[PDB]
Design a protein around this ligand. Sequence first.
Ligand SMILES: O=P(O)(O)OC[C@H]1O[C@](O)(CO)[C@@H](O)[C@@H]1O
Ligand SMILES: [Mg+2]
Ligand SMILES: [Mg+2]
Ligand SMILES: [Mg+2]
Length: 329
Amino acid sequence: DTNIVTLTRFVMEEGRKARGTGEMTQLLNSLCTAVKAISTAVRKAGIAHLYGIAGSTNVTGDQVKKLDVLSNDLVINVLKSSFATCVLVSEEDKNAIIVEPEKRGKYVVCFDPLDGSSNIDCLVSIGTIFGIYRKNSTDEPSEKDALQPGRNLVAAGYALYGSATMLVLAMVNGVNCFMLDPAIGEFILVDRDVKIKKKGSIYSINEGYAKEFDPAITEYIQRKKFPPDNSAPYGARYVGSMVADVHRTLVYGGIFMYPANKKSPKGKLRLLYECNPMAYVMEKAGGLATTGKEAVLDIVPTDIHQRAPIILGSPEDVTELLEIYQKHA
Ligand SMILES: O=P(O)(O)OC[C@H]1O[C@](O)(CO)[C@@H](O)[C@@H]1O
Ligand SMILES: [Mg+2]
Ligand SMILES: [Mg+2]
Ligand SMILES: [Mg+2]
């Protein structure tokens, strides 16, 4: 253990030749601290009486859990103090947060402080999702600086509070996974340069919405259950927490779906702090992320709380679904 390959070091080493100010290291170190604090709280939530609701509703009309409040405060406070940020967008706040002049840095951060709210009380895996942009304007920071297409991301990733706590970080040249060592409070590199398989054998979707699915999603699911070539049908997995289903898709291959449907023209998941970060991870891992008609990373948002359909995973799987959408167009 006398040579610890920490997230901090990894991020510093890799970007030593590319010169720079080092605020990204500052930013990520800061986020790592929030993530450890959130992990620790989650791991003892029932004894700390942190299960249950807060007594409020966010703009996308969700019921605010107590862990939502704690996680949101922790992430906002550490990013503010990092001296690396100017504009913050969170699922739990109606408007973009503008950092005080004294603490401003060059980055814009979009995040979901706690993802998988419906799974909190039953102890299923939950997580934290983030996407980081460089501010491009030269005028005063504002919500508009958050309204960039996902392809403009410079880093993105998530923390998974699962059987272990994992920080998955994607940047311009690839994806790397760091596991939290709970004894020393450090994220250790455990998977380098992760790449998704070209084709998997698991599909992930909430089939409770079958009555509302479009014909293409309907056809695809039927094909996973009854393959026309006598191959083995795909297995099904749906934890119910985007971070957990997407993490599995990344390391085992396959496809994850939260499509548009008859009641939800743009799906459920939020483009800025759920769909773009996972789409970015997936594309840097050799995967694809589509709405069924266009690349998620190419959408130009007009609303920080905008929703988007998302279909992601192994490229041959996502492509097969796109072919079906194309055929039905
Ligand atoms: O209950 P549903 O509609 O399947 O929604 C589950 C999805 O909702 C979320 O909790 C976000 O609200 C995601 O983490 C998860 O993928
Ligand atoms: Mg979420
Ligand atoms: Mg959330
Ligand atoms: Mg929620």
